[PDB]
């Protein structure tokens, strides 16, 4: 006879779920539309029209949608597959119907780990930062809404830092000092709860300097010194101090607390007689030299030297 019946699906739409762990060729859904108008015209030919985006395919005669060749399914991905049941009458006398498949990609067994907003974090702290002061909230959220367990794993042997098990706030647990340790680099972890479900991340704490160390003089350098009389710019002796702080806070500058019209001092701390010294006038000069770090909010140190002038 003629073509008299339209190839029809039983439903309008299909919600079906797909996973990350799937491989090419794995069956997604068997769609079967009835035409039942027997002839060439009773014989159906399926086809995805649009919305597969290269990650899906249907077998023409069977009506079976499968994962396409060579594709990796990204998680949390929407797809809407319009699939067309075409009957095999001539093009003139053809009939068509449509059906839409609504798919979402999931994680393997639908449970990713909890993920951090970043893979690395760069912090900065002053060694002077108050104990208990919060450094960083590590709010790593969990796709499925599971409860999170935070904890540091490596990079903190001291436990100088405390990461709240529940809240993910990173407080400071013991007092910082920069000379002890100049920077910490932690490894931190969120837990889904099961072993498969745990992400990692790295925090890079960098401690910055305060002037909390006065320049200390070398203990062994000579304090009891000699000089020749009747000589301007004559060498007397040398002092030396150091500062375990850094920057301008590390640089030491030598100054004289007395006798600065008589004696002078260099950048390096060498002391010279600025004028023609004399034994008949003054054979005991008890001089005090001062080291001051060249810093904002500076610190001082003193050293009384014992200079006794000789003649020859
Ligand atoms: Ca038909
Ligand atoms: Ca999870
Ligand atoms: Ca310090
Ligand atoms: Ca200092
Ligand atoms: Ca310091």
Based on CA atoms alone, the radius of gyration comes out at: 41 Å
Number of E strands: 27
Bound molecules: calcium ion
N-to-C CA distance: 141 Å
Structural class: mainly beta
| Total domain count | 3
CATH-defined fold name of the largest domain: Immunoglobulin-like
Shape descriptor: rod-shaped
Question: Mind telling me which CATH architecture of the largest domain this is?
Answer: Sandwich
Protein name: Protocadherin-15
Domain Cadherin: 10-116, 117-217, 219-312
Subcellular location: Cell membrane
Glycosylation sites: 59, 162, 224, 268
Features:
312 residues; five-stranded mixed sheet; rod-shaped; Immunoglobulin-like; Protocadherin-15; 27 strands; 3 domains; binds calcium ion; mainly beta; Hearing; 44% strand; monomer; cell adhesion
